[PDB]
Design a protein around this motif. Sequence first.
Motif, PDB file in Angstrom:
ATOM      1  N   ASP A 292       0.818  -1.208   0.000  1.00 10.26           N
ATOM      2  CA  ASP A 292       0.000   0.000   0.000  1.00 10.26           C
ATOM      3  C   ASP A 292       0.854   1.261   0.000  1.00 10.26           C
ATOM      4  OD1 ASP A 292      -2.710   1.013  -0.120  1.00 10.26           O
ATOM      5  OD2 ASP A 292      -2.425   1.799   1.909  1.00 10.26           O
TER       6      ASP A 292
ATOM      7  N   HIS B 288       7.212   1.173   6.174  1.00  8.88           N
ATOM      8  CA  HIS B 288       7.091  -0.228   6.634  1.00  8.88           C
ATOM      9  C   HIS B 288       8.440  -0.930   6.361  1.00  8.88           C
ATOM     10  CE1 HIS B 288       2.749  -0.688   7.456  1.00  8.88           C
ATOM     11  NE2 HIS B 288       2.487  -0.032   6.341  1.00  8.88           N
TER      12      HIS B 288
ATOM     13  N   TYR C  61     -12.767   0.618   7.528  1.00 10.21           N
ATOM     14  CA  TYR C  61     -12.947  -0.657   6.834  1.00 10.21           C
ATOM     15  C   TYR C  61     -13.925  -1.564   7.571  1.00 10.21           C
ATOM     16  CZ  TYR C  61      -8.829   0.813   4.244  1.00 10.21           C
ATOM     17  OH  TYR C  61      -7.886   1.507   3.514  1.00 10.21           O
TER      18      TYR C  61
ATOM     19  N   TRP D  27      -2.512   5.998  11.804  1.00 10.54           N
ATOM     20  CA  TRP D  27      -2.124   5.957  10.398  1.00 10.54           C
ATOM     21  C   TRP D  27      -2.857   7.096   9.696  1.00 10.54           C
ATOM     22  CZ3 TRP D  27       1.769   3.234   8.462  1.00 10.54           C
ATOM     23  CH2 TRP D  27       1.843   3.004   7.094  1.00 10.54           C
TER      24      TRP D  27
HETATM   25  O1  FYJ Z   1      -5.428   0.775   4.029  1.00 13.86           O
HETATM   26  C1  FYJ Z   1      -4.553   1.401   4.690  1.00 13.86           C
HETATM   27  O2  FYJ Z   1      -4.585   2.668   4.738  1.00 13.86           O
HETATM   28  C2  FYJ Z   1      -3.476   0.613   5.446  1.00 13.86           C
HETATM   29  O3  FYJ Z   1      -3.867  -0.755   5.520  1.00 13.86           O
HETATM   30  C3  FYJ Z   1      -3.002  -1.457   6.418  1.00 13.86           C
HETATM   31  S1  FYJ Z   1      -3.405  -3.232   6.432  1.00 13.86           S
HETATM   32  C4  FYJ Z   1      -4.994  -3.433   7.267  1.00 13.86           C
HETATM   33  C5  FYJ Z   1      -6.167  -3.318   6.543  1.00 13.86           C
HETATM   34  C6  FYJ Z   1      -7.374  -3.492   7.198  1.00 13.86           C
HETATM   35  C7  FYJ Z   1      -7.404  -3.780   8.553  1.00 13.86           C
HETATM   36  C8  FYJ Z   1      -6.226  -3.897   9.268  1.00 13.86           C
HETATM   37  C9  FYJ Z   1      -5.017  -3.714   8.622  1.00 13.86           C
HETATM   38  C10 FYJ Z   1      -1.512  -1.355   6.073  1.00 13.86           C
HETATM   39  O4  FYJ Z   1      -0.758  -1.868   7.141  1.00 13.86           O
HETATM   40  C11 FYJ Z   1      -1.098   0.056   5.715  1.00 13.86           C
HETATM   41  O5  FYJ Z   1       0.174   0.039   5.115  1.00 13.86           O
HETATM   42  C12 FYJ Z   1      -2.087   0.709   4.792  1.00 13.86           C
HETATM   43  O6  FYJ Z   1      -1.686   2.013   4.480  1.00 13.86           O
END
Ligand code: FYJ
Lengths: 588, 588, 589
Positions: free
Chosen positions: B177, B343, B467, B536
């Motif tokens: 990502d 990462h 999500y 994040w």
């Molecule tokens: O979508 C995003 O913004 C982020 O997704 C996460 S992974 C994840 C997806 C759903 C639930 C839990 C973890 C990645 O670690 C990060 O690099 C990325 O930027």
Amino acid sequence: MSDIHLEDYTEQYETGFATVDTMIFEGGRREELLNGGWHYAVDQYDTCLRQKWYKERYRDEKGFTVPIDYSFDEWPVMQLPCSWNTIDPMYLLYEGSMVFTRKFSYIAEREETVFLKVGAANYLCRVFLNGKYVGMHRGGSTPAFWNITEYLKAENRIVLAVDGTRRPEQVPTENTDWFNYCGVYRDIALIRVPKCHIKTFKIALVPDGTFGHVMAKVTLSEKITAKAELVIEELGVSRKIQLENGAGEVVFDAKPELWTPEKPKLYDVKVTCGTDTVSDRVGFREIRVNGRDILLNGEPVFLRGISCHEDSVENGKGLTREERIENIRIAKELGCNFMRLAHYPHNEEMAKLADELGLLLWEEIPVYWAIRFEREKTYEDAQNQLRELINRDWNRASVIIWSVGNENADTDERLKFMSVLAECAHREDETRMVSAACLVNAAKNKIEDRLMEYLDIIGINEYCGWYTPDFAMLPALMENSQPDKPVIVTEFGADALPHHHGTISDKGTEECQADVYEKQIATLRNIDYIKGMTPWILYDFRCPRRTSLIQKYYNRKGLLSEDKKYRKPAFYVLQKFYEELKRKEQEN
Amino acid sequence: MSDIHLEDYTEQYETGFATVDTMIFEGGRREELLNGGWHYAVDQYDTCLRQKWYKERYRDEKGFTVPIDYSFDEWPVMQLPCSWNTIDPMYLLYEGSMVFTRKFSYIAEREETVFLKVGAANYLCRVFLNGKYVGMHRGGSTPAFWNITEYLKAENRIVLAVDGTRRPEQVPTENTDWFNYCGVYRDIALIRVPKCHIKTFKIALVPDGTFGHVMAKVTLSEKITAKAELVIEELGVSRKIQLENGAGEVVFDAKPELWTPEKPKLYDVKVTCGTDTVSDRVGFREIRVNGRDILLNGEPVFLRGISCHEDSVENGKGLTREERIENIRIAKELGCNFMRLAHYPHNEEMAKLADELGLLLWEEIPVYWAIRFEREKTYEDAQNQLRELINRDWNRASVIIWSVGNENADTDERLKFMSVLAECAHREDETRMVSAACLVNAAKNKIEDRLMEYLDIIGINEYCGWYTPDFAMLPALMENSQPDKPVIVTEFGADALPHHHGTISDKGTEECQADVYEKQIATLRNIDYIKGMTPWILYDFRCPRRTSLIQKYYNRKGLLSEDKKYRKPAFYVLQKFYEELKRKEQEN
Amino acid sequence: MSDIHLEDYTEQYETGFATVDTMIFEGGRREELLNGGWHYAVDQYDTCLRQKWYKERYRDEKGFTVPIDYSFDEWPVMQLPCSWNTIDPMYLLYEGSMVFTRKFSYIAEREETVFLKVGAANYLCRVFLNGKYVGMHRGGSTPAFWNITEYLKAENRIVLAVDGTRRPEQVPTENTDWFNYCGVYRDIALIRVPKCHIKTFKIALVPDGTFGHVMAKVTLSEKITAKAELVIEELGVSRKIQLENGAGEVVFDAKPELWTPEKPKLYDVKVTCGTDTVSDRVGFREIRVNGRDILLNGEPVFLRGISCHEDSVENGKGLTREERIENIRIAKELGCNFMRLAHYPHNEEMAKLADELGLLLWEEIPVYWAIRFEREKTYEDAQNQLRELINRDWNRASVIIWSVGNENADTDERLKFMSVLAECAHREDETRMVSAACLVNAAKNKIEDRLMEYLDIIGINEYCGWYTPDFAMLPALMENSQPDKPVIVTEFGADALPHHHGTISDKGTEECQADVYEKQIATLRNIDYIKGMTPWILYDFRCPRRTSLIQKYYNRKGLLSEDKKYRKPAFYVLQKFYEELKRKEQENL
Ligand SMILES: O=C(O)[C@H]1O[C@@H](Sc2ccccc2)[C@H](O)[C@@H](O)[C@@H]1O
Ligand SMILES: O=C(O)[C@H]1O[C@@H](Sc2ccccc2)[C@H](O)[C@@H](O)[C@@H]1O
Ligand SMILES: O=C(O)[C@H]1O[C@@H](Sc2ccccc2)[C@H](O)[C@@H](O)[C@@H]1O
């Protein structure tokens, strides 16, 4: 979390294939196109195939909106068809995936079957319609048909995910000497036909030396028994064809005028069966080989040729009608009766225009350099493109030779692979000659290659005065070799940057290029078994392997500049040689 | 004709590896850089590795010039180091190979060994010096060292072929990502050392709870017996270290002021051995875990964190010193004592500035999503990157946690793979805590992951309100879970295109993002076992997966815009939370 | 420390001159061009000539690298030939030096002599080969040849230093009415020839009134006794020419079709001697003057002409073949049988295309306005350029007139200077008429100038209704004048910015330009000693002297815009007059 944790996200799409068995005959058929503005995204990581954007899930089961990584209607817009590389400098070097979508309406007036045709997409094309997967096509230069009848609604959304990625196991591999133009770059059509329709129509002079018999084969979409009626009014032909369980043939007496490039006579042909009608515009000619002779309509010929890539400064691989015409016109101004279309199927219009304007053609599949010859799926790919090419252009009188590949090493697995390719070509087309561009045996400096025993005509690439710099190697090569079949010299030449000059010994200049042609012609013209030549190449083309100041990411072996507005000196050398042949031929 | 017919053209270059075992300690060392203008070509088909341009074969054995596909001195010029993607729009999406070359002169004033350091190059970097192959590096974010002593001439030509190609078996895989910034993007150095030189130097407070013992370890380039001398003047330390067969250790007494983000005390350290001398600038601190507590210098801490990518509008992954400083400064304005560097290894200057300005750090390797955990060479790549990271940053008091990966599925082969990585980190660094971003068991809505047993600290990514759109899932998650160790919430957040506004239910707007943070903070702040959070993310970053009109190829979960000039509302939400914690901290 | 304290740093390069004596005949010769991309630098202070970059001194006598101010292979690249001014807007107004360099390989298949030709370089061209000075050339519109045989290696680096500088003592001076296009702007060629090669070859119909005698002269590179064989198959000719001391000539009987612009008949001619062969394509015609009559092949003619500069929006002075063809085509559309090529030698292809498509030509050297007539080295330079032009174009049937200058003061030193150039032209070419553009005697308003006694045809520049605003001055001038020779009005006209309209009294507008043409034609057409006119000018050209809003650094006297896409009203006035003359000529048959 499958979108991010599934390793093999592509296997689910290895179904619904478009192949030669799925093609339908297009001659005479009304088509609506889907050419136009499609909304698009750069999908570098193939995110659409993973998250399944075409499913348009905006809310979950409990009714909440969920985040999404696309906005179809609010995406930018791109005119299709095109090579996306030439659409903007940002995409010139882009060869990942792009996702295109658009809407369209569908009203059936009668009961009908509907095919989606994608004229060409390099290299993979995956089709989605109203949230469902239709299937995919493998191979970058051949049309793909899918039956979409059961998928249509009144209002429709179609999504095309097209991957330009190069892979060692594909045909071609990741290493070639031409530019990787990607995207959907020939027409996208909707084709309505009756549920029982004419699926294949092949017609040709029987190559029996009498010029008096015409053959015709027809197959239907259905294994039903029925009669079809073939009509060629100009020749007084009206013959019914008895089809049993979808298939039928007929051989009948007719004496058409024989097509040649000088006299490209063409006849209108109509075929009916039930409520279906197809039609075609075809020439009749015999191409045969007898010992070292190439026989067109009974008479030995010399193929005055040039090679040509499907390339364009503004349009990439998506050449226009006018650019094809220009290519034919310049070749004839060059004195050509013959053109080698390398190294892949060009747009089908090229052979149609060659039918009409008068030019003999060689058509080729990109079995090029280090194909993974031992990989069964790589053979399935190559074999399918070969048969796609042959079924697509079966009725083209201009086309006399199919080529099963170019410049492949003389190994066992190569020999097993390409010799079966050659046999496949013969089974699909009893009328045309089968060839391939073979290399010179370097250790011996001799025309020697195990694949030649399986071809009708030996194609030879040699670059004496260039990659093999010593010119004395050219006469030696020809005297060290005494073939049994005709030889076409399928490539020779040299780099010349337009308007870059020097002495004859400055490789890469115009003067050196002209010199290489002088010495090449002086030998080749007096070699008994050389029956043709298609020098490399008509005009400069994009080439990722050429990074020097006097190359600038073009292959500079063109006889013209890349925009075809400038003829280099070597152009006039070859033209003078072909005019000599043209006049000696008329003094006969 | 190897350059066109060799299939596995790269196997010949799988040698001469730069690995952790080839790194040398740089502290205090004088270095001459090769930064500057390098002549370069875009090598889409890897032609240089096939044709071996670095040999500079311009004539054959009988003295004819041969055609070539490169012109080193006449190529265009690119300033290295850089992410080539940000240098020109034509390269933004280019992730094939580029070839770089330049010259330099070498004169040895005394007997010496010479290393080439490439500070980072993503993903593959192959090195040629004066026509000879030196070796290669696998892994995009770690410094590579090669001994080039035997290759140097008075006048030198160095060639770097750097491949940005993404591959499923690499670390990371082809699906992440974040943006695929390619090329040589950290300093290129020449490093002159005595043939017997100090090869590794590690120094740390012994983590035994007494804050009165310091350990220090030295290894040499040669397996000899000698004495090294460690000097820390400000602490009156001057100990001799006895080395046997190239390695030696010492524990000794000292009571330094203990490093904290609030008082980042740093001491000058010097080590000498033979004619070699190295030096460092280090802090002393204890990081330990006890039950659910994270202990810094004996005291439990809550880590007020933010996550951060290595991204820049101008500079791609090649951030400047001032951009690094800006990042720390803005994190502290946010009220952060902690920062998760995701990462992959950032530039080593990050931890040096964090050492200086006072910020606790988490560092990580890109063992990310669907790594090929079953593939032994993929493990070899991951373990080497991990150890490259640990050896590079061993002396950085700022760094308290190593992370061996992020959001990987709870499979058997992932467990074998990543638990052996955690063990590896503990063997290479006895001083720091080992963690990973694990996933939430979705079936149970519970913190449940077999990997957690092998971690000192549990990292959790959850996106409740995003999500997982139903906010009620977050208090449920935290009640369903009763971990025995500290948990850091390593990710939560939401998208907000800068200056895009809507209702709190409009996902993708500023208002909804501030709402998500409000509700995330109201639950998390009262969970006993949660000892930190790194939302994040700090600022928007390039992201090939986000193609919507309110994303525009950026991940929009930044608290600031991608140029860091604008703070979204959620920025101020997290800030007031962290200021509450800082105030209540002082009242105690 | 010479590079910085040396005052006269150019003296050392005043040697190895390419002159008329150094040219070789080029007809039929195979040539390898050095056209293409050359690495280059702007050298504003002539640093290359002072520091001698071409020696490529990179280390000192004890092996230390030394700081240098160039880097040949890593310099940017310019496509030669071109006028550098139109290559990038940053060079439009640049007229200093640029240094060009490239490499090339050389392998002789035979013992051979090699010439470097620079087709044209304005104004100075200094030549270096493999670190040694070859020589230079002075004069910006003529081809230069150096014998480089002794300089060549297997691998060669050539360097060209080309100075644009305008100087008052040059030919022309620092002050003209056209644009100072600079650089190497015609072909650079390598020419391989036998050790003893044909050096000059001149052929012409004898102008004796019979039309039955052809003269052919030949010279060799070596002062030896030998014979040359001349062949003209179509005329069934095959004479040997006896040569002594490398020179010989012949007169023989032949009856060719006589070249005219309406029937431009050309013959293939071949000349061999030793292992050498040249060839040419020549027309045969007679141009003479009988009293006030201009006689082409024995018949009086009126020269329906236009003037033309060597100018191009895109290419500057570096015109392409298709721009030349355009110029001829548009002149013929205008009704011309004649063209004044001003004020310097154009590309030699111009006279060749005129040979083929049919157009009589006036060619000229830039002895223009205030030439330093008293300076002997300025005479040498002008004399050289005239002889270069005559030697280059001797065999072009299209060219009937050589002009030794334009609009110079009637002083004594001017008289000595230009009369000697006229005698020179006559001595070098017995076949052609000699002329020049003389000014009107302002005292008497009368065609009167002491140079005219030396000229076969009088040229007059006059601008009544423009620079002389009162049209009455034009009938007055013709009435005042009764010359004994034929007169060509070699210039008249008026500015008109394209699409800029006004009244006929608004100077600078289309309407005023047309009105000036109406009145000039109405007076000139009835003056019986006026035998031609080349109105100024066919199309607008760059001009540093015209700065008004309705000029925009272009001379606007063109009958068409500078891109030749638009015809102004006056174009049709001249056209209508020439078509009247043409119809009158047909009905006189
Ligand atoms: O979508 C995003 O913004 C982020 O997704 C996460 S992974 C994840 C997806 C759903 C639930 C839990 C973890 C990645 O670690 C990060 O690099 C990325 O930027
Ligand atoms: O280099 C080239 O110009 C061409 O090389 C040939 S292969 C070859 C190379 C050396 C000897 C004989 C054959 C390819 O067929 C062609 O596509 C490419 O453009
Ligand atoms: O000014 C002009 O348009 C032209 O002037 C004439 S000189 C002259 C000026 C006044 C009267 C008689 C002659 C030049 O020969 C020409 O190059 C220039 O372009």
